A paper describes a structure:
Shiga toxin (Stx) is the major virulence factor of STEC and is an AB5 toxin consisting of a single A-subunit associated with 5 B-subunits (AB5). The A-subunit encodes an active N-glycosidase that binds to the 60S ribosomal subunit and removes a conserved adenine residue from the 28S rRNA, which inhibits host cell translation and results in cell death. The B-subunit is a receptor-binding protein. Recently, we identified a new subtype of Stx2, designated as [name], in strains isolated from a broad range of hosts in China, including diarrheal patients, goat, pig, and raw meat (beef and mutton).
Author numbering:
A (entry chain B): 1 to 242, 257 to 297
B (entry chain D), C (entry chain I), D (entry chain H), E (entry chain C), F (entry chain E): 1 to 70
């Protein structure tokens, strides 16, 4: 299906993302507070996607709304971007299974991972800055792109758009922190180490939160939700576990310890310490 | 003999470097330093432990114990 | 040889300071102390392990085990 | 004597290879090395620990401690 | 030299008391018993590890390793 | 003195059996084998650590460290 993210104002941005969330996901019974929830992506057939138009980055421009981003629905991975003015779909190499009718599909050499993109972009997500201005230049860079080999400038654009679209969809914390750049003040949003670490634990969080039943807190690796409102303020959309990214090892999603819900693998990872007694040599 | 079976209610590190746990209302201590992390882990993750010893009076020592996940 | 592959059904610290686990319906013990906390953490989280040994009969000793992610 | 009781506010490995934890607003150190990983796991999971020493002055040493869950 | 970078596909305690990990499709073993709990913890939490060694052929030894959250 | 406070960005086990952490953009290493499990557990659980040393420049050693959950 087709959707739009309107960057005109903070409220149009938030309403755009919420409309996508409502359509592709279902709130969790035990983590919602009015219209603000943690929602599980509804299962769709493999290859299912959404085409998300980008708009409102410069309201003095009636023809800056010709960039689209193709997003696989089950995982919110960005498969590629579409120049509607040239009817050309530039597709990452790991998404050969995503096909668009009636659009000139261009299969590119490199993949969509942040490791590949950061290397080519010479830019790390941690500390990366995003403003309305730099999003416009990101839009320009992608619309001025040609060929099948991603460039530094196109990779920087993708990294910025992934954060403010797909990552913002997943994490209400990224939505809330970034939307301040859509003010008339035009400030700059910086993606913090905390923001990045959230995206690196998305699958791990997705495997834990379905088991939440009102516990005081939740611990997932380096992530800490110290009350339920911290959960809703951080997380908006999670994967459907029961996707390969939901499990690292083992089969026990959580361990409840003192009314805190722990990712079991985290507990296991600091409970496997031998008697310090045995730190010895040659005796 | 199976002296006690249940969750660990408390554990204690003793000044003589021994380690005590309370299972099924009765306390048991052990000399084996390797069991200290194994026991605290069981206590934290809710494992059912089965203390096994030839002397099952509360306050007695042990060095054999089974761990079940619940 | 691959003697048994599966979850650890239970573990047991033995009085002779060896360590026992049940995998795939069979019991094996080990004298390697370093394995004790590693095997318990595998048990708590449901990690499937592979016991390897020249002797695969229930009751045999082992000193080689693979920790898998499936 | 029960010197202090509560959750571990912070812990600290010291230059002299001892380990200190802050409980109920009071600091206590121990030279027992096996208590280092045990106290860290207790701090990480919000265990209620009971510090027991012959010397309960804030900043004094200890070698006995009880671990309780909620 | 950076031999391999990626998450731990499996780990293995070996009969000679060394510890093997497979990273990025190749196997590497080490002799440092301290790395056994560290390497399993990385596998359990899905850390990106970087094996560093003079000898980066699959099946070769190592004793330097970086643990990244990435 | 307090050289760095924050979460551990990465850690590294070094060929010489020492152990390195990166906190607040700078690296520090320690010879105490006993900080190895404590430091790595802090990393994977996201504790905020406070490195303490007479020597506070990146690449320098330490043997005093505070652990906080928050």
């Amino acid at each position: 299906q087709e959707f739009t993210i309107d960057f005109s104002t903070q409220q149009s941005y938030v309403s755009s993302l919420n409309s996508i969330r409502t359509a592709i996901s279902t709130p969790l019974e035990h983590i919602s507070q009015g219209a603000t929830s943690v929602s599980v992506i509804n299962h769709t057939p493999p290859g299912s996607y959404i085409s998300v138009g980008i708009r409102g980055l410069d309201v003095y421009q009636a023809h800056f709304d010709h960039l689209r981003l193709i997003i696989e629905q089950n995982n919110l991975y960005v498969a590629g971007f579409v120049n509607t003015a040239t009817n050309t779909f530039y597709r990452f190499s790991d998404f050969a299974h995503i096909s668009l009718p009636g659009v000139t599909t261009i299969s590119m050499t490199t993949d969509s991972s942040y490791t590949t993109l950061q290397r080519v972009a010479a830019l790390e997500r941690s500390g990366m800055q995003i403003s309305r201005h730099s999003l416009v230049s990101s839009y320009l860079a992608l619309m001025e792109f040609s060929g099948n080999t991603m460039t530094r400038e196109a990779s920087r654009a993708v990294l910025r758009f992934v954060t403010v679209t797909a990552q913002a969809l997943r994490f209400r914390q990224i939505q809330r922190e970034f939307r301040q750049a859509l003010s008339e003040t035009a400030p700059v949003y910086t993606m913090t180490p905390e923001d990045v670490d959230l995206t690196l634990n998305w699958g791990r969080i997705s495997n834990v939160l379905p088991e939440y039943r009102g516990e005081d807190g939740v611990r997932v690796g380096r992530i800490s939700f110290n009350n339920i409102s911290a959960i809703l303020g951080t997380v908006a959309v999670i994967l459907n576990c029961h996707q390969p990214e939901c499990q690292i090892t083992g089969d026990r999603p959580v361990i409840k310890i003192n009314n805190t819900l722990w990712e079991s693998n985290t507990a296991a990872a600091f409970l496997n310490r031998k008697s310090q007694s045995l730190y010895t040599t040659g005796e | 003999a199976d002296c006690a079976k249940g969750k660990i209610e408390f554990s204690k590190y003793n000044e003589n470097d021994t380690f005590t746990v309370k299972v099924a209302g009765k306390e048991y201590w052990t000399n084996r330093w390797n069991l200290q992390p194994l026991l605290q882990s069981a206590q934290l993750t809710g494992m059912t432990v089965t203390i096994k010893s030839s002397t099952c009076a509360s306050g007695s020592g042990f060095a054999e114990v089974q761990f079940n996940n619940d």
